[PDB]
Each structure stands twice: as C-alpha cells, then as structure tokens.
Amino acid sequence: RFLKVKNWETDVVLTDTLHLKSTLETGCTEHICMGSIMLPTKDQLFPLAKEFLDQYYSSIKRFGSKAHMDRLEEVNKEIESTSTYQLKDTELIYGAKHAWRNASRCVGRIQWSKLQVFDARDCTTAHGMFNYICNHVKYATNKGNLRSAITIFPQRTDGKHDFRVWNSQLIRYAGYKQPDGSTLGDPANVQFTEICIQQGWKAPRGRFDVLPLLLQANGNDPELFQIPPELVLEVPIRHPKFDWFKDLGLKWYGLPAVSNMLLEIGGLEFSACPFSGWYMGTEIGVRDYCDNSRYNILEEVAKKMDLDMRKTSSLWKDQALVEINIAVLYSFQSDKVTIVDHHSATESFIKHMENEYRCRGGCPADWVWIVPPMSGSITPVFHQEMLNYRLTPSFEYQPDPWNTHVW
Amino acid sequence: RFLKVKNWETDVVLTDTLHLKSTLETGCTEHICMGSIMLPVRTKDQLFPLAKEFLDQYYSSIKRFGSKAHMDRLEEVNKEIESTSTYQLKDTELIYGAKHAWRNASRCVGRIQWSKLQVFDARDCTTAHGMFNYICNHVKYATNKGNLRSAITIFPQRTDGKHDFRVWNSQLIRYAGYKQPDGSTLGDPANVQFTEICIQQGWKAPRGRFDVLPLLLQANGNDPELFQIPPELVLEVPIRHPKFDWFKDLGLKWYGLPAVSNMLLEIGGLEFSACPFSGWYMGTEIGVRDYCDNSRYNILEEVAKKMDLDMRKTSSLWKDQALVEINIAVLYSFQSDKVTIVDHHSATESFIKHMENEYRCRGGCPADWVWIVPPMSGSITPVFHQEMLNYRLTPSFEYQPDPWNTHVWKG
Ligand code: HEM
Numbered sequence: 003r004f005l006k007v008k009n010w011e012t013d014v015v016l017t018d019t020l021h022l023k024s025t026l027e028t029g030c031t032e033h034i035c036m037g038s039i040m041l042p043t044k045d046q047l048f049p050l051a052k053e054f055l056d057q058y059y060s061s062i063k064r065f066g067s068k069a070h071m072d073r074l075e076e077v078n079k080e081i082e083s084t085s086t087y088q089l090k091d092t093e094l095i096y097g098a099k100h101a102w103r104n105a106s107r108c109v110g111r112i113q114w115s116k117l118q119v120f121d122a123r124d125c126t127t128a129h130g131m132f133n134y135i136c137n138h139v140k141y142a143t144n145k146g147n148l149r150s151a152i153t154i155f156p157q158r159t160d161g162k163h164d165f166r167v168w169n170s171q172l173i174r175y176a177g178y179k180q181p182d183g184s185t186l187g188d189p190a191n192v193q194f195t196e197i198c199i200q201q202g203w204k205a206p207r208g209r210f211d212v213l214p215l216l217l218q219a220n221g222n223d224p225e226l227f228q229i230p231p232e233l234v235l236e237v238p239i240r241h242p243k244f245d246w247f248k249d250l251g252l253k254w255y256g257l258p259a260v261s262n263m264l265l266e267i268g269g270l271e272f273s274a275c276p277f278s279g280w281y282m283g284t285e286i287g288v289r290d291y292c293d294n295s296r297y298n299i300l301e302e303v304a305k306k307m308d309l310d311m312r313k314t315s316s317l318w319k320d321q322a323l324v325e326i327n328i329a330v331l332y333s334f335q336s337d338k339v340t341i342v343d344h345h346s347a348t349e350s351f352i353k354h355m356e357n358e359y360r361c362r363g364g365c366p367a368d369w370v371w372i373v374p375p376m377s378g379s380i381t382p383v384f385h386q387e388m389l390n391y392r393l394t395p396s397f398e399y400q401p402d403p404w405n406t407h408v409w
Numbered sequence: 410r411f412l413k414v415k416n417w418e419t420d421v422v423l424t425d426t427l428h429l430k431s432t433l434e435t436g437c438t439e440h441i442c443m444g445s446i447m448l449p450v451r452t453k454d455q456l457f458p459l460a461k462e463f464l465d466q467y468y469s470s471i472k473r474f475g476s477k478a479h480m481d482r483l484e485e486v487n488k489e490i491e492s493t494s495t496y497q498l499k500d501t502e503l504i505y506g507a508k509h510a511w512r513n514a515s516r517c518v519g520r521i522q523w524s525k526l527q528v529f530d531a532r533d534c535t536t537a538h539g540m541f542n543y544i545c546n547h548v549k550y551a552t553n554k555g556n557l558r559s560a561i562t563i564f565p566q567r568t569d570g571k572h573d574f575r576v577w578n579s580q581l582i583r584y585a586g587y588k589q590p591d592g593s594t595l596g597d598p599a600n601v602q603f604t605e606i607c608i609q610q611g612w613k614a615p616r617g618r619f620d621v622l623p624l625l626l627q628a629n630g631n632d633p634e635l636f637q638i639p640p641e642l643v644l645e646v647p648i649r650h651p652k653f654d655w656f657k658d659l660g661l662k663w664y665g666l667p668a669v670s671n672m673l674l675e676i677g678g679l680e681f682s683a684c685p686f687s688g689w690y691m692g693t694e695i696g697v698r699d700y701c702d703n704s705r706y707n708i709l710e711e712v713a714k715k716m717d718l719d720m721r722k723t724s725s726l727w728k729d730q731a732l733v734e735i736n737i738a739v740l741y742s743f744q745s746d747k748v749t750i751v752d753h754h755s756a757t758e759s760f761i762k763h764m765e766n767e768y769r770c771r772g773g774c775p776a777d778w779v780w781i782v783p784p785m786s787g788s789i790t791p792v793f794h795q796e797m798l799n800y801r802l803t804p805s806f807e808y809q810p811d812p813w814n815t816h817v818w819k820g
Pocket residue numbers: 102105107108109110111113117150151152277278279280281282285342347371397
C-alpha cells in the first residue's frame with residue numbers, strides 16, 4: 003500500500019501514497035505489463051463532481067466547510083435538474099493546473115502552477131475559436147520569451163455539439179505525397195494536409211508550410227483559418243561550428259502547442275483545450291528531424307560531415323545526432339526563443355519529483371516518456387524509478403475527429 | 410485472447426497469444442505500472458505441477474507430447490518427488506531448460522542467439538575448488554581467444570536452502586573498487602562492498618584502477634573460498650580511439666567476457682542458485698554505463714576536457730559529444746583486437762528480427778522496453794519505436810539476494 007521508489011544513482015528512496023487516490027486503469031495486469039504501449043449520466047457525473055470538489059476544497063484548506071457543503075448541494079441540484087454543471091472560474095483554473103500536474107508523460111511539470119488559463123467557454127463559432135487561438139498564440143509566444151497557456155472551449159454536452167481543433171498542434175508543417183513516391187515536408191501530416199486541401203486550402207506545396215487551423219464549433223462542420231504569419235515565430239537552424247548547416251534549409255517553430263487532447267475536470271469533458279509551453283531541444287532535433295518516418299535528415303547531415311557511413315559501428319548516426327541537436331539549441335538561444343536542453347529539463351523534473359513526494363506523497367510518472375530519446379543514462383531520470391498511475395483532472399487522448407464527424 | 414503490439418515507425422502490427430501461458434506476476438496492477446522498478450525450500454505439493462508443466466513443454470518441443478516416453482518420464486518424476494522430495498533433470502531437459510530461460514529473458518536484447526548456448530553440466534561438483542575448476546574451463550571455452558562463444562555452467566540445484574552453491578561475485582570478471590579515507594574511490598565504485606569482503610577473506614589487493622577481482626565461491630552451503638582466475642585466462646582490451654591519439658593516455662581498458670554469476674535459474678520448479686552465463690558485449694554497456702554513469706568510472710569530464718569542448722553550459726551538449734566518442738573508442742578497440750562485440754544499432758535491429766520471428770513461430774516474445782532500449786541514442790534504434798509486452802515465462806533467470814546478506818557463517 004505504501005510503495006517505494008529508488009534512485010539507483012543516488013540511493014534516495016521515496017515513498018508513494020498518492021497512488022491510492024488513483025482512479026482510472028493503466029492497461030497493465032499482474033500477468034502483463036503494457037508500459038510501452040502508446041494507447042493502452044447524472045449517476046456517473048455526481049461522484050466525479052464530488053471527488054473533484056473534495057480535492058479542490060482541501061487544497062484551499064476549506065474541507066468540510068460551509069462553502070464546501072454549499073457548493074456540493076448546488077452542483078447536486080444543478081446536475082439533478084440539468085444533467086451537467088458549470089465550473090467556477092477558480093475550479094476551472096485549479097482543474098487545468100492539476101491536469102498538467104497529473105500528466106505522467108510530461109517532463110516539464112516543475113512549471114505546473116505557472117499556467118495562464120484562458121476561459122473560452124463563452125465561444126460559439128469557429129471564427130470565435132480562431133480569435134481565441136490567435137490571442138493564445140501571441141500571449142504564449144511573447145516575442146520569444148515563452149509563457150505556458152491553455153485555452154478552454156465549452157465542455158461536451160450531449161456529444162453531438164463538440165468543440166474540436168482538428169490540428170494535432172496549433173502550429174505544424176504540411177506533408178505532401180508526391181508523384182516521385184517520396185514525401186515532401188512532414189510525413190506525419192499527410193492525411194491532415196489532404197483534409198485541409200479537400201476543404202479548400204491553398205497549399206503552397208513547400209517543405210515547411212505552416213498548416214491552417216481547422217476549427218469545429220458546436221459540433222458543426224470545421225472551417226479553415228490561416229494564423230497570421232506575424233504571430234508564428236520560427237527559428238532558422240544553424241550550427242555554431244559548421245557553416246554549411248544553414249544550407250540544409252532547416253527551420254522549426256518556437257511554440258509547441260498540443261491541440262487535440264481532452265481535458266477532464268470533475269467528470270466534465272473539454273474536447274478542445276489547446277495548451278502550450280516551450281520546447282525541450284530533443285523533441286525537435288531527435289524526433290522531428292531524425293525519426294525515420296519524420297524529416298529523417300540523418301543521412302544528409304552525416305554526408306555533409308563526411309563521416310564513414312559504411313558501417314553502423316562507426317557510430318555515424320550518433321555523431322550527426324549530437325550535432326543536429328547542438329544546432330537546434332544554438333539557433334533557439336541565439337534568436338532568444340525559450341528552449342530547454344534535456345540535461346537541464348531532466349534535472350528539474352527530479353527536483354520536482356522530490357517536491358511532489360514531500361508535499362503530495364507522490365508524482366505519477368511514465369519512465370518510457372520521461373527519459374529523453376538521446377543519451378538516456380547520462381540524464382538523471384534514467385536512474386530514477388517512477389510509478390505510473392492515472393489521476394484526475396487529466397489530459398486524455400481522443401479519436402481524430404474526421405474518423406467520427408458526421409458531415 | 411489476443412494482444413496487439415505496433416511498431417510506430419513501420420506500422421507492422423503483431424499479435425501475442427503466448428502471454429496466455431504466462432504464470433508469475435509482474436508487479437503491475439490495473440491501478441499501477443511498475444515497469445520502471447528494478448526489482449518489483451519448496452513443497453511436493455507445488456513441485457509436481459511445475460515439473461509437469463515443464464515436461465509437457467519439453468515433450469511438445471521434441472514432437473513427442475503424449476508419447477509413452479513422455480508418460481513414463483512424468484510417472485518417473487512423480488515417483489521421484491514423492492520418494493525424495495525433489496527430482497533430477499536429464500541432460501537433455503537441462504540443456505532445453507537453460508536455452509529457454511535465456512529465450513524467456515525479457516530484459517535481454519541479445520536473444521536472437523538463444524538456441525546457440527554451450528551448456529556445461531556441473532551438477533557433479535561438490536567443493537569450491539571444483540567450482541573454481543569448472544569456472545576456469547567455462548571462461549577459457551567462452552573466451553575462445555576473442556571469438557566469443559555463449560556458455561552457461563550449471564552447479565547443483567537447491568535442496569533445503571541450507572546447502573546452496575553460490576558464486577558471490579556478481580560477474581565472473583570485474584574490477585575491484587576501493588573507498589579512500591578522503592572519500593574518493595579508486596577503481597570501480599560498484600564493487601567497493603564486494604572488494605571489502607574479498608580483502609576481509611584474505612585477498613591481497615594491488616589497489617589499482619583495474620584489478621580483476623578473485624572469485625569468491627560457495628559450495629554446498631559452506632563458507633565461501635577465494636581463488637584468483639589465471640590472468641592468462643582473462644582477456645582484456647586497452648581502449649584507444651581511431652582519430653584521437655590522446656585517448657590511450659586515459660589508461661582505460663575493459664575485459665572481453667561479460668559473464669553474469671549471481672542469478673538463479675529456475676527449470677521445472679528446480680532452483681539452480683549458481684549458474685554463471687556469458688555471451689559478448691554490446692558496446693554501450695561499457696562505453697555508456699561502466700564508463701559514464703556518475704556512480705561508475707565517471708570519465709565524461711576528463712574526456713570532454715581533452716576534446717576542449719565548451720563545458721560551461723550543459724546546452725553545448727558536451728556530455729553527449731564526449732559520450733559518442735567514448736563509445737566509438739570501445740567499438741574500435743574490440744574490433745581491432747578481434748574480440749567479439751556488437752554495436753547498439755546492429756544489436757537492436759537483430760532483436761527486432763528475432764522478435765518478429767518469435768511472434769510468428771511462438772505466438773509472442775516477452776520484452777522489457779525499459780531495458781531493451783539502449784542507454785544512448787534511444788530513438789535512432791528501431792526498438793524505441795517498438796511496442797512490447799512484458800510477462801514472465803518459465804524456465805527463467807531470476808535475481809536473488811546477495812549471499813553475504815543471508816549466509817550463515819560456519820567459521
Ligand atoms: C513549459 C514547458 C514544457 C515542457 C519543457 C514540456 C515537456 C514535455 C515533453 C518533452 C513531452 C513529451 C512529448 C512527446 O514526446 O511527444 C511532454 C508531454 C506532455 N505534456 Fe509537457 N511540457 C511543457 C509544458 C506543458 C504544459 C503547459 C502542459 C499542459 C498544460 C503539458 C502537458 C503535457 C501532456 C498532457 C503530455 C503528454 C502528451 C501526449 O501524451 O502526447 N506540458 N511534455
């Protein structure tokens with residue numbers, strides 16, 4: 003019932019009790035671990051509402067106060083009559099911060115309590131959504147001094163009136179299948195790009211075309227909007243030693259902003275809740291640039307470095323990998339766009355785990371995602387045992403909307 | 410029931426049925442995943458079903474399930490258990506059992522090799538001197554002058570838990586560690602405690618940075634005894650770098666033969682508490698973990714200094730840069746001395762092919778992603794993108810507590 007996690011580099015042992023408050027299922031059993039699998043009514047709503055309000059009122063040190071019992075009877079009355087309920091601003095803010103706090107796959111959670119919440123629950127149309135989104139982008143970007151933000155659109159009602167951002171991130175590049183048989187741009191985005199073109203988009207057909215937003219309000223058909231280019235901060239990628247690096251034609255955007263998840267607070271479901279922070283360098287330099295099914299640039303870079311590509315054991319892939327990632331961090335730092343390296347992020351996350359163990363009795367964490375995709379064991383998180391469990395409020399995955407939308 | 414795993418790079422989807430034969434528990438539940446936790450005297454009653462399950466598997470593997478030979482073997486084992494409380498494996502069953510413990514080792518990336526394993530039967534061994542001799546022979550056979558061959562030596566099984574054979578070393582070959590009065594460590598800090606035990610037992614320590622430890626060997630539950638492996642049997646590689654001539658002057662070397670000696674082999678309910686096995690190294694084990702862990706030789710600073718890297722900011726990636734050069738050096742050195750080694754690209758690619766074959770021929774392949782993914786350059790190896798299912802099959806290799814913690818000293 004009390005569980006220990008050990009750090010094998012430092013011998014520090016922490017005790018987890020927070021897991022007992024865990025509610026949802028991991029996908030594992032006593033017979034099988036699914037730790038590396040990517041995706042493992044009024045009667046339902048009231049326990050959910052109650053559990054959330056109990057944790058909310060405890061956090062403000064007013065558990066079992068009149069204010070507490072009053073809010074419970076009020077929501078109870080509201081659910082019993084209207085089948086849903088509305089969160090107070092204070093509850094919404096608390097719920098959003100905590101869904102981030104509980105995000106077991108997020109290495110950047112030391113920042114959890116510094117999150118600007120934009121309440122967009124009064125939004126009714128796709129143009130409205132676009133206005134809210136541009137304002138989030140500009141606020142978060144802050145001319146390169148990035149600030150964490152979330153914008154929260156109206157909650158699910160009967161499920162036929164969902165608000166959704168169709169994009170997976172607010173800012174991503176287009177992907178095009180070619181007569182050649184190769185892919186131009188980002189291969190991850192081929193299908194979404196096609197959906198955009200078929201809905202009317204004027205694709206430039208370049209390597210790095212910022213995708214239009216495709217916004218769905220009130221369960222209506224989604225609409226296209228082009229984010230003002232002056233609000234999309236981009237970084238030209240150069241290397242501090244290799245003058246040729248710039249000729250590769252590489253750039254990335256400054257603002258990572260996940261826009262396809264579901265925020266669940268007190269049993270209420272917010273199907274459109276784009277959120278953003280700032281990058282850890284490896285996301286761009288390891289995953290975006292070097293994944294084989296992504297920009298897949300290792301071959302090109304190694305060739306420019308004139309490495310021996312004849313045998314895997316020369317570690318040419320590894321060598322070029324480091325260089326690419328050096329370039330990403332240098333370019334961002336030189337243009338004064340907030341970025342964190344994997345060393346510094348993982349060190350902060352260990353500090354955050356310790357604070358969470360001390361102040362909350364634990365920190366749910368998914369080792370498979372926390373450990374960076376390069377140089378695993380030379381970061382402290384590699385040697386840190388982590389317990390993975392699901393707490394609410396939460397961010398959840400949801401089916402891509404085109405699979406489900408009735409046109 | 411069917412479980413699917415996907416590769417997110419290739420979109421190859423596989424179906425696991427083998428997890429249905431899985432017995433033991435993972436440590437995980439529906440409410441918690443303990444996938445990153447390092448560590449999450451039987452009865453006749455419990456023994457015959459374990460024997461039976463094993464023998465059914467063995468006899469199916471040879472296409473003789475339900476044969477007279479199969480039935481007679483079940484009867485003979487059943488009778489042996491009721492009469493003596495235990496039983497003895499036939500040579501053939503031992504070999505099969507040891508091969509399958511390796512096949513089932515979900516944390517091992519090298520399992521493509523599982524069916525090529527030399528099994529040395531040391532169940533007639535009675536003394537620590539006998540153990541030493543068996544172990545010298547395994548080391549010489551496995552080393553094979555650099556052309557490494559996988560082997561396991563199997564000492565007598567547990568009886569009452571009071572007469573255990575144990576090898577006290579965690580690996581047959583490892584370097585001593587020495588805690589200094591000023592708090593620094595000379596040699597391998599991982600082996601400080603074991604080194605102290607060796608010294609107490611009477612080892613004369615050379616007190617250098619790479620002193621091969623003696624074997625400390627326990628036969629039949631007796632107090633363990635010290636033996637020096639003949640140095641001519643211990644193949645070592647001095648580490649140099651193909652382009653950087655100053656690399657040799659760090660004075661690094663490592664041994665060629667990785668040989669785990671502290672695990673317990675379970676076959677059909679029998680427990681082999683001393684079963685040293687060896688294969689060959691994947692480069693990163695040395696270049697990343699042994700050399701670069703903060704709690705090990707910790708050479709990153711000194712290497713990056715000599716490379717004149719910008720060390721004032723982590724964001725220069727000086728650590729990542731020196732790390733790659735160190736690992737190039739290890740691979741170069743072994744290859745130049747014709748000592749078998751595999752790089753992490755080649756090893757992981759081979760593992761994926763092994764895994765897919767296993768799904769097709771066996772209905773699954775239990776695999777622990779946390780351990781399978783190499784400790785550098787994770788996502789440019791194909792295993793990073795491979796979903797895996799971790800579950801426990803027998804025969805198996807298991808951890809056991811260090812023996813100095815449990816041993817009853819006789820004097
Ligand atoms: C402030 C800087 C932040 C950093 C450096 C950071 C870091 C990261 C990284 C590296 C990942 C893994 C992503 C991947 O590999 O695809 C991640 C995942 C995630 N983060 Fe953060 N994060 C930050 C801010 C935020 C914010 C503001 C939120 C929400 C309010 C958030 C919630 C999440 C969630 C839910 C995931 C899992 C996403 C998924 O499952 O695909 N993070 N974080």
